[PDB]
């Protein structure tokens, strides 16, 4: 969920 969000602390892609 967190990786899909922009606020998430690290890149998921």
């Known amino acids: 969920?967190?990786?899909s969000?922009?606020?998430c602390?690290?890149?998921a892609r």
């Open 1 to 3: 969920g967190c990786a």
């Open 5 to 7: 969000d922009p606020r």
């Open 9 to 11: 602390r690290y890149r």
